[PDB]
């Protein structure tokens, strides 16, 4: 005999997921009971929203599938933001949601009567209800197959309460369904590889830019090797920063491409799983020039040439493309030109921007955000996972995070939902309890999930939560003040409360840092503690980060 | 010329809503700028989830329309729980959600690419996106008309960013819900219902949420007093019936009558067969009884039990028509005092028996805490209930409290809705007292709203009964599966009083039942947001927890 | 200045679509007005249902994108069956549907108040509403990109009337958006190709089976070559029959694999864009053995191992795989084993089945269906397009269609929606007016769209509609009689009406065939006429096609 919950855990075991995140409820308890016997670990949270965000962070940091367990009704609805965030971010998460019993369907009963699949459908690759317990292993396998393959994304499986508690015979409990984990991925053809490498060799000022989809299929090694073989500068968005960071050819976030002169602009750009959008300054061309020869490799043809003309488009796996290109570039008969002058100009461009912003900083009595984020970047150990939340907070960190020796940098996606950081950091920590996890967040955002400090305490997850407190919803205040004037700032000031105070009351290490000098030592000690820590950093609200201009009007200086 | 933000505030003003709840964002700012110029009040929160819940409580306590302002993307999605809660609870809330700019539609831009209307459609009476700025007054009025008329429910209007910032010429007035006539009982129907009532041996009235919407209870109390019929209700309807001497409190009190004493006629005023009625089991409303059901949705008539007569009309208007005719009823009304005395003996006997059977340990008994709270709340105050075991225990004492409105869990039963609900309920009337009775697990959802209350001057008294666990879920595991099977339900960490203090609120801990009532009294007199952490015992099983699990409450 | 209708016609021109199908209305009329000026051809039909099916058939026979134009309200809703059909069949059709004006939204006006995007969403790859006329070129290009790349499928674009009638600058018309026509497709990697060929050479009894996604790409030449190099028997489902037919290694429909002995069953199977489903007898193994080594190439990982365990899975374009595999197979160092004995046994099985089923025919007064479809198969010209409708009709045609020299055989997909044939052939005919198009349909199915005889006459589309008239809803009648008994036959008999009479009244050539000897001569003359023709063949109801037993559960024999 096997219950439906047993069937769920067994399939999750076969998929090699060690942790799931949820809040217990009677509808979903059969999964928890199975996890107790099979000694599968479920980390409970204080909001189901952060249970989903934890699965996201677990997936993003672990380079694995993430699983969230949601009970019926409000258990599901509280997770919708995480589903939406994973949807836009191309993140592989499986959401398991209990539902009302089918046998008493339409009885106005507890936590029932909500079409959870319909709510989830617009923001999932697949949302389906499992109506029979025997279907459970096969349908979860299909869900995982969909979620884990490009473009990655969330899947919702709704399992009614009486389907979860129903039983099947041990024979069906043991048959093996296809998880696609060893399925061969869309690679670049021989003819395509020669065309791409040919144009690259012919370029005067070529650049590679990587995106999330390159990371989700361990394309980092291949892309770095290809960049190093060809000597092409490597850029990326936040989701791929860890994939490119190790390469000497790495130049960090692609926002650094701004500022080149008219002749200096890149003539050829090869995109590895990056979409035209917020990260590229849309099709404006300030980062990726419209007159440049753009080579786009993405798993969804809807992205090819979306906002900008592209010279060549490939509908394939960006990770496999890098490997195929790296292999052929090694034995490339013509050899590769010396791009040292091009590389040096970009290094002067990127390093100049860091230097100029630091020089231009105007200091008041409170800590300058540029000084704070420089402190954090210079202190985080090699191989660290850094999570970024808050708006002005993450915009400032974007100037220094490229210098940090990070395994993964988890920042805001297209949804740009403030508050996702704490839950995300929690799940990233559950990926490796040994590895350091630092969350840099704003004072407004951290308020979304204050109770999650208790979850980290009870689960033993030593995230260091660095709160840059400007005493406001910062960027929203800036938008009002800069665009409409200082008379128009309204409903954005947060001049109350101690976040270190809240975290301490919830059992975590808590410290305040009003002095820039005390930041780096305090962070160093926080990492050594092996304890959940909140560092409240009192910073100035006034400084406008360079990237803040881009989003309102570009032209950042 | 007026911006779309101005048009929203203009219609909200004509709709007679003075407070809105949201978190500001760049997409929705046109509304905030209009509110600043118009001196319209927007209360900011720490989570858009509680911005939505504030609108529900503002609506539920205020007997008015509630309005939530949600910015694009995560702003909207964070409120989905509130929409779903209002959906099942039949609560009139207008959710206004910004969206991406239409001019840069499908550009992978900020907070965009989400079909907010499709996401909201299954849990709203109406979900629609406004594509042109000129349509705003007419479409908002349509939304309000839908939201405010029976059965009440949430409506979502999605307004793209470039629609909000667009302008129109100043040149009319659109029809909102108010002054519409509602479905009353016909003259023939009134006589048939009243005729059967006079003939009844043991008649009972039960009121539901839809009676409260529309000020039904004044009429319902009179009719119960005129006919001498015992008056019952669910939690949303408790305040409507509470004042009547014919009131017997929450309808769970009907359990326990013997087979002959069992009620013979039941008239439902806007209450649905469901969790509140123990579905069609008959333990509260007997299946053998002649049931007369008055609801606005024919899908509700006889859903789980046979009904003798069903009317699709407005329950508030039904009470008025019936009360008028009962006053001049030629035959007169029989003396039900023996039946009422039996019911009073039943209800009060239960309160006393539960108090007697209490097993006390070193920590505060949950029955003692809610008895203290009920006897301490001022008259006409709003009491909000969250947590599972917490609200289930409160169900035994809340009827005796002199409460204006009792805001408890609906069918969604989503733990965490309490704080936002209480915050918005307080914004309805800042002077009148609001007490939230919540569990330790539930209050963790919205801990940061203590900061919102401080900045907004909303003096909610948050009473946290702390059992150091997600209580009812632990009980379900322990009672059904055994004590070895309890897993993922224990919360033996943290000080919620400590958390509130760090956010600027009044904070106190209560370890002895003797100090509870005095402490609550100061908190109410303080005029400050207050958190009272009451350390209570986890073990005692509230009687209603068995009904949720399996019939038989004792 | 350009109207929105001009923009839509201009993009369709760039996508190289010469024909679109619709029914005129005031809402969508600007597209018709722009097409009149630009000499873009719109074929009107008698039902929007067949306007959609015409776009499907045009796309399937034409190996191109199909476009259907629907006016607001009922115009859109009448096409829903066609959208669902393309959805399950993986057919690339772009549906452009007008809607009510945004300026009079929610005014209870004509043909308005219907959420056409919401209705289409469950049955489309993308369903979207165009709110501003400026977005028109970019959104259509995105729509086309989604529709044309694997897995192909339908896309719905909703354009409000007042957006269509709105105007934009000429410069906006000049800019070119990406139609993905030269985007490169997911190919097999060098490592991947080596693994597959290695297993193929080692196989004792390998088979290739092709599916719809091989034909949407140009994989037939590469697949036939690969089959010829390696000597591997080639099979397919109906949508790929035309892709394999030319090869001497082709053995026709994959249903012909049934009946081999346990030792004889294939040990290795390579699937090229075919899904486990109705075409494969699900995961039953009667066609594709469950213990066989299966290599599956599909565009969606949700299909990999859906109903059967697979040895190897590739998420790529099946057409590109055939090309990569064919190139390496040619120069395969080991060479290829002599599969002569395996080929002879398969030919013995396939040809033996044809002779046996014909031999087993018991004839009554009316024409036997096996003789009728044998005549049709033996008479249709080379390079002909055959469309199949009706139930028992298409099941019988399955026994002979493999022998017909057809360029494309358009038969029922998973939807199995009776009535699609007439519209499909109409659009299939519009692809190439010179090429012959023969539709073999049942009496019930042809009743769905009798008025399209008027469309074929007026448009000059000379479809030959052969109606196999059993005077009943055949397969449903058989299901009642076979499972429940002859007394339980109810609501399935159609003993009335002359379909030849109807076609004649609508201006088509009409002939009745009561004697099998006249069938082939009549078809030859009808094909030579160059006029729309209806041939009503009075056929026997009694004979049960072998495949009907499989559709019901049991074996073919
Ligand atoms: C869920 C959600 N609500 C509202 C917004 C709008 N918004 C963008 S930035 C910002 C301010 C964030 O303040 P804080 O977390 O203190 O960070 P800071 O900008 O001050 O560094 C807000 C409210 C959003 N992005 N997401
Ligand atoms: C949103 C949501 N998540 C989870 C549940 C499942 N659930 C029912 S009761 C309960 C425990 C509530 O704990 P607390 O608020 O401390 O109240 P107590 O039962 O301890 O009195 C939980 C998690 C739910 N009903 N709603
Ligand atoms: C749209 C649709 N409606 C109904 C059916 C059910 N159905 C399956 S076969 C069949 C009979 C078809 O009769 P006819 O077209 O005369 O072909 P025959 O089986 O007689 O050869 C019917 C009604 C269907 N498959 N599709
Ligand atoms: Mg801040
Ligand atoms: Mg509790
Ligand atoms: Mg027939």
PDB file of N, CA and C in Angstrom, chain B residues 258-317:
ATOM      1  N   UNK B 258     -32.745  17.094  21.904  1.00  0.00           N
ATOM      2  CA  UNK B 258     -33.255  15.739  21.754  1.00  0.00           C
ATOM      3  C   UNK B 258     -34.212  15.657  20.572  1.00  0.00           C
ATOM      4  N   UNK B 259     -34.521  14.420  20.166  1.00  0.00           N
ATOM      5  CA  UNK B 259     -35.207  14.187  18.897  1.00  0.00           C
ATOM      6  C   UNK B 259     -36.563  14.880  18.844  1.00  0.00           C
ATOM      7  N   UNK B 260     -37.306  14.874  19.951  1.00  0.00           N
ATOM      8  CA  UNK B 260     -38.589  15.574  19.968  1.00  0.00           C
ATOM      9  C   UNK B 260     -38.434  17.097  20.006  1.00  0.00           C
ATOM     10  N   UNK B 261     -37.405  17.619  20.690  1.00  0.00           N
ATOM     11  CA  UNK B 261     -37.241  19.065  20.874  1.00  0.00           C
ATOM     12  C   UNK B 261     -36.665  19.761  19.640  1.00  0.00           C
ATOM     13  N   UNK B 262     -36.215  18.986  18.672  1.00  0.00           N
ATOM     14  CA  UNK B 262     -35.488  19.448  17.515  1.00  0.00           C
ATOM     15  C   UNK B 262     -36.313  20.486  16.751  1.00  0.00           C
ATOM     16  N   UNK B 263     -35.682  21.558  16.219  1.00  0.00           N
ATOM     17  CA  UNK B 263     -36.481  22.622  15.585  1.00  0.00           C
ATOM     18  C   UNK B 263     -37.292  22.125  14.387  1.00  0.00           C
ATOM     19  N   UNK B 264     -38.533  22.629  14.266  1.00  0.00           N
ATOM     20  CA  UNK B 264     -39.417  22.223  13.182  1.00  0.00           C
ATOM     21  C   UNK B 264     -39.486  23.202  12.005  1.00  0.00           C
ATOM     22  N   UNK B 265     -39.178  24.483  12.201  1.00  0.00           N
ATOM     23  CA  UNK B 265     -39.162  25.437  11.094  1.00  0.00           C
ATOM     24  C   UNK B 265     -37.946  26.340  11.218  1.00  0.00           C
ATOM     25  N   UNK B 266     -37.236  26.528  10.107  1.00  0.00           N
ATOM     26  CA  UNK B 266     -36.020  27.334  10.061  1.00  0.00           C
ATOM     27  C   UNK B 266     -36.115  28.291   8.882  1.00  0.00           C
ATOM     28  N   UNK B 267     -35.918  29.581   9.144  1.00  0.00           N
ATOM     29  CA  UNK B 267     -35.885  30.611   8.108  1.00  0.00           C
ATOM     30  C   UNK B 267     -34.470  31.168   8.044  1.00  0.00           C
ATOM     31  N   UNK B 268     -33.829  31.021   6.890  1.00  0.00           N
ATOM     32  CA  UNK B 268     -32.456  31.463   6.687  1.00  0.00           C
ATOM     33  C   UNK B 268     -32.459  32.815   5.985  1.00  0.00           C
ATOM     34  N   UNK B 269     -31.722  33.773   6.540  1.00  0.00           N
ATOM     35  CA  UNK B 269     -31.651  35.125   5.995  1.00  0.00           C
ATOM     36  C   UNK B 269     -30.236  35.352   5.479  1.00  0.00           C
ATOM     37  N   UNK B 270     -30.014  34.996   4.216  1.00  0.00           N
ATOM     38  CA  UNK B 270     -28.728  35.222   3.595  1.00  0.00           C
ATOM     39  C   UNK B 270     -27.606  34.337   4.082  1.00  0.00           C
ATOM     40  N   UNK B 271     -27.919  33.171   4.647  1.00  0.00           N
ATOM     41  CA  UNK B 271     -26.912  32.204   5.055  1.00  0.00           C
ATOM     42  C   UNK B 271     -26.945  31.003   4.124  1.00  0.00           C
ATOM     43  N   UNK B 272     -25.766  30.521   3.757  1.00  0.00           N
ATOM     44  CA  UNK B 272     -25.627  29.370   2.882  1.00  0.00           C
ATOM     45  C   UNK B 272     -25.352  28.114   3.693  1.00  0.00           C
ATOM     46  N   UNK B 273     -25.840  26.988   3.191  1.00  0.00           N
ATOM     47  CA  UNK B 273     -25.413  25.698   3.714  1.00  0.00           C
ATOM     48  C   UNK B 273     -23.931  25.515   3.425  1.00  0.00           C
ATOM     49  N   UNK B 274     -23.157  25.269   4.468  1.00  0.00           N
ATOM     50  CA  UNK B 274     -21.731  25.112   4.291  1.00  0.00           C
ATOM     51  C   UNK B 274     -21.017  24.828   5.590  1.00  0.00           C
ATOM     52  N   UNK B 275     -19.779  25.313   5.695  1.00  0.00           N
ATOM     53  CA  UNK B 275     -18.992  25.090   6.899  1.00  0.00           C
ATOM     54  C   UNK B 275     -19.742  25.565   8.135  1.00  0.00           C
ATOM     55  N   UNK B 276     -20.407  26.719   8.036  1.00  0.00           N
ATOM     56  CA  UNK B 276     -21.107  27.288   9.184  1.00  0.00           C
ATOM     57  C   UNK B 276     -22.291  26.435   9.633  1.00  0.00           C
ATOM     58  N   UNK B 277     -22.950  25.732   8.713  1.00  0.00           N
ATOM     59  CA  UNK B 277     -24.121  24.932   9.054  1.00  0.00           C
ATOM     60  C   UNK B 277     -23.802  23.453   9.211  1.00  0.00           C
ATOM     61  N   UNK B 278     -22.522  23.093   9.276  1.00  0.00           N
ATOM     62  CA  UNK B 278     -22.093  21.694   9.233  1.00  0.00           C
ATOM     63  C   UNK B 278     -22.612  21.009   7.969  1.00  0.00           C
ATOM     64  N   UNK B 279     -22.638  21.761   6.875  1.00  0.00           N
ATOM     65  CA  UNK B 279     -23.048  21.267   5.553  1.00  0.00           C
ATOM     66  C   UNK B 279     -24.476  20.718   5.675  1.00  0.00           C
ATOM     67  N   UNK B 280     -24.785  19.585   5.052  1.00  0.00           N
ATOM     68  CA  UNK B 280     -26.118  19.024   5.141  1.00  0.00           C
ATOM     69  C   UNK B 280     -26.264  17.921   6.170  1.00  0.00           C
ATOM     70  N   UNK B 281     -25.384  17.921   7.174  1.00  0.00           N
ATOM     71  CA  UNK B 281     -25.408  16.867   8.182  1.00  0.00           C
ATOM     72  C   UNK B 281     -26.667  16.917   9.039  1.00  0.00           C
ATOM     73  N   UNK B 282     -27.241  18.100   9.236  1.00  0.00           N
ATOM     74  CA  UNK B 282     -28.436  18.239  10.036  1.00  0.00           C
ATOM     75  C   UNK B 282     -28.228  18.428  11.527  1.00  0.00           C
ATOM     76  N   UNK B 283     -26.982  18.471  12.012  1.00  0.00           N
ATOM     77  CA  UNK B 283     -26.783  18.594  13.457  1.00  0.00           C
ATOM     78  C   UNK B 283     -27.210  19.968  13.956  1.00  0.00           C
ATOM     79  N   UNK B 284     -27.116  21.001  13.118  1.00  0.00           N
ATOM     80  CA  UNK B 284     -27.611  22.322  13.484  1.00  0.00           C
ATOM     81  C   UNK B 284     -29.004  22.571  12.922  1.00  0.00           C
ATOM     82  N   UNK B 285     -29.141  22.551  11.600  1.00  0.00           N
ATOM     83  CA  UNK B 285     -30.425  22.733  10.928  1.00  0.00           C
ATOM     84  C   UNK B 285     -30.954  21.348  10.567  1.00  0.00           C
ATOM     85  N   UNK B 286     -31.997  20.855  11.228  1.00  0.00           N
ATOM     86  CA  UNK B 286     -32.435  19.477  10.985  1.00  0.00           C
ATOM     87  C   UNK B 286     -32.936  19.280   9.563  1.00  0.00           C
ATOM     88  N   UNK B 287     -32.533  18.155   8.967  1.00  0.00           N
ATOM     89  CA  UNK B 287     -33.023  17.797   7.642  1.00  0.00           C
ATOM     90  C   UNK B 287     -34.529  17.565   7.655  1.00  0.00           C
ATOM     91  N   UNK B 288     -35.074  17.095   8.782  1.00  0.00           N
ATOM     92  CA  UNK B 288     -36.512  16.882   8.910  1.00  0.00           C
ATOM     93  C   UNK B 288     -37.289  18.178   9.087  1.00  0.00           C
ATOM     94  N   UNK B 289     -36.604  19.295   9.293  1.00  0.00           N
ATOM     95  CA  UNK B 289     -37.269  20.570   9.483  1.00  0.00           C
ATOM     96  C   UNK B 289     -37.729  21.149   8.153  1.00  0.00           C
ATOM     97  N   UNK B 290     -38.830  21.894   8.204  1.00  0.00           N
ATOM     98  CA  UNK B 290     -39.263  22.715   7.080  1.00  0.00           C
ATOM     99  C   UNK B 290     -38.367  23.945   7.031  1.00  0.00           C
ATOM    100  N   UNK B 291     -37.553  24.056   5.983  1.00  0.00           N
ATOM    101  CA  UNK B 291     -36.552  25.114   5.855  1.00  0.00           C
ATOM    102  C   UNK B 291     -36.998  26.112   4.793  1.00  0.00           C
ATOM    103  N   UNK B 292     -37.014  27.391   5.160  1.00  0.00           N
ATOM    104  CA  UNK B 292     -37.298  28.493   4.246  1.00  0.00           C
ATOM    105  C   UNK B 292     -36.013  29.287   4.056  1.00  0.00           C
ATOM    106  N   UNK B 293     -35.500  29.309   2.830  1.00  0.00           N
ATOM    107  CA  UNK B 293     -34.202  29.902   2.518  1.00  0.00           C
ATOM    108  C   UNK B 293     -34.362  31.164   1.675  1.00  0.00           C
ATOM    109  N   UNK B 294     -33.787  32.277   2.141  1.00  0.00           N
ATOM    110  CA  UNK B 294     -33.790  33.542   1.402  1.00  0.00           C
ATOM    111  C   UNK B 294     -32.346  33.903   1.060  1.00  0.00           C
ATOM    112  N   UNK B 295     -31.986  33.777  -0.216  1.00  0.00           N
ATOM    113  CA  UNK B 295     -30.660  34.141  -0.698  1.00  0.00           C
ATOM    114  C   UNK B 295     -30.776  34.783  -2.074  1.00  0.00           C
ATOM    115  N   UNK B 296     -29.742  35.536  -2.451  1.00  0.00           N
ATOM    116  CA  UNK B 296     -29.710  36.202  -3.749  1.00  0.00           C
ATOM    117  C   UNK B 296     -29.259  35.291  -4.887  1.00  0.00           C
ATOM    118  N   UNK B 297     -28.732  34.104  -4.595  1.00  0.00           N
ATOM    119  CA  UNK B 297     -28.235  33.188  -5.615  1.00  0.00           C
ATOM    120  C   UNK B 297     -29.010  31.883  -5.532  1.00  0.00           C
ATOM    121  N   UNK B 298     -29.684  31.525  -6.628  1.00  0.00           N
ATOM    122  CA  UNK B 298     -30.466  30.296  -6.646  1.00  0.00           C
ATOM    123  C   UNK B 298     -29.583  29.067  -6.532  1.00  0.00           C
ATOM    124  N   UNK B 299     -28.284  29.204  -6.814  1.00  0.00           N
ATOM    125  CA  UNK B 299     -27.366  28.090  -6.619  1.00  0.00           C
ATOM    126  C   UNK B 299     -27.289  27.695  -5.155  1.00  0.00           C
ATOM    127  N   UNK B 300     -27.654  28.604  -4.252  1.00  0.00           N
ATOM    128  CA  UNK B 300     -27.611  28.316  -2.830  1.00  0.00           C
ATOM    129  C   UNK B 300     -28.857  27.603  -2.324  1.00  0.00           C
ATOM    130  N   UNK B 301     -29.991  27.753  -3.003  1.00  0.00           N
ATOM    131  CA  UNK B 301     -31.246  27.180  -2.527  1.00  0.00           C
ATOM    132  C   UNK B 301     -31.198  25.654  -2.520  1.00  0.00           C
ATOM    133  N   UNK B 302     -31.384  25.069  -1.340  1.00  0.00           N
ATOM    134  CA  UNK B 302     -31.415  23.625  -1.208  1.00  0.00           C
ATOM    135  C   UNK B 302     -30.152  22.922  -1.647  1.00  0.00           C
ATOM    136  N   UNK B 303     -28.999  23.584  -1.524  1.00  0.00           N
ATOM    137  CA  UNK B 303     -27.749  23.001  -2.001  1.00  0.00           C
ATOM    138  C   UNK B 303     -27.487  21.649  -1.347  1.00  0.00           C
ATOM    139  N   UNK B 304     -27.486  21.603  -0.013  1.00  0.00           N
ATOM    140  CA  UNK B 304     -27.128  20.394   0.716  1.00  0.00           C
ATOM    141  C   UNK B 304     -28.282  19.752   1.477  1.00  0.00           C
ATOM    142  N   UNK B 305     -29.438  20.403   1.560  1.00  0.00           N
ATOM    143  CA  UNK B 305     -30.575  19.912   2.326  1.00  0.00           C
ATOM    144  C   UNK B 305     -31.855  20.294   1.606  1.00  0.00           C
ATOM    145  N   UNK B 306     -32.905  19.486   1.723  1.00  0.00           N
ATOM    146  CA  UNK B 306     -34.202  19.886   1.168  1.00  0.00           C
ATOM    147  C   UNK B 306     -34.740  21.127   1.866  1.00  0.00           C
ATOM    148  N   UNK B 307     -35.327  22.022   1.086  1.00  0.00           N
ATOM    149  CA  UNK B 307     -35.970  23.212   1.623  1.00  0.00           C
ATOM    150  C   UNK B 307     -37.446  23.167   1.252  1.00  0.00           C
ATOM    151  N   UNK B 308     -38.301  23.605   2.179  1.00  0.00           N
ATOM    152  CA  UNK B 308     -39.733  23.648   1.902  1.00  0.00           C
ATOM    153  C   UNK B 308     -40.060  24.791   0.954  1.00  0.00           C
ATOM    154  N   UNK B 309     -39.504  25.971   1.215  1.00  0.00           N
ATOM    155  CA  UNK B 309     -39.724  27.138   0.377  1.00  0.00           C
ATOM    156  C   UNK B 309     -38.401  27.859   0.180  1.00  0.00           C
ATOM    157  N   UNK B 310     -38.144  28.264  -1.055  1.00  0.00           N
ATOM    158  CA  UNK B 310     -36.958  29.025  -1.379  1.00  0.00           C
ATOM    159  C   UNK B 310     -37.329  30.313  -2.071  1.00  0.00           C
ATOM    160  N   UNK B 311     -36.711  31.417  -1.668  1.00  0.00           N
ATOM    161  CA  UNK B 311     -36.923  32.703  -2.309  1.00  0.00           C
ATOM    162  C   UNK B 311     -35.581  33.284  -2.723  1.00  0.00           C
ATOM    163  N   UNK B 312     -35.486  33.717  -3.976  1.00  0.00           N
ATOM    164  CA  UNK B 312     -34.294  34.392  -4.490  1.00  0.00           C
ATOM    165  C   UNK B 312     -34.566  35.884  -4.362  1.00  0.00           C
ATOM    166  N   UNK B 313     -34.116  36.472  -3.260  1.00  0.00           N
ATOM    167  CA  UNK B 313     -34.297  37.896  -3.050  1.00  0.00           C
ATOM    168  C   UNK B 313     -33.272  38.430  -2.073  1.00  0.00           C
ATOM    169  N   UNK B 314     -33.373  39.724  -1.794  1.00  0.00           N
ATOM    170  CA  UNK B 314     -32.481  40.355  -0.827  1.00  0.00           C
ATOM    171  C   UNK B 314     -32.942  40.028   0.590  1.00  0.00           C
ATOM    172  N   UNK B 315     -32.116  39.368   1.408  1.00  0.00           N
ATOM    173  CA  UNK B 315     -32.567  38.968   2.752  1.00  0.00           C
ATOM    174  C   UNK B 315     -32.897  40.130   3.670  1.00  0.00           C
ATOM    175  N   UNK B 316     -32.197  41.256   3.545  1.00  0.00           N
ATOM    176  CA  UNK B 316     -32.537  42.415   4.362  1.00  0.00           C
ATOM    177  C   UNK B 316     -33.953  42.896   4.064  1.00  0.00           C
ATOM    178  N   UNK B 317     -34.285  43.055   2.777  1.00  0.00           N
ATOM    179  CA  UNK B 317     -35.630  43.476   2.389  1.00  0.00           C
ATOM    180  C   UNK B 317     -36.681  42.460   2.818  1.00  0.00           C
TER     181      UNK B 317
END
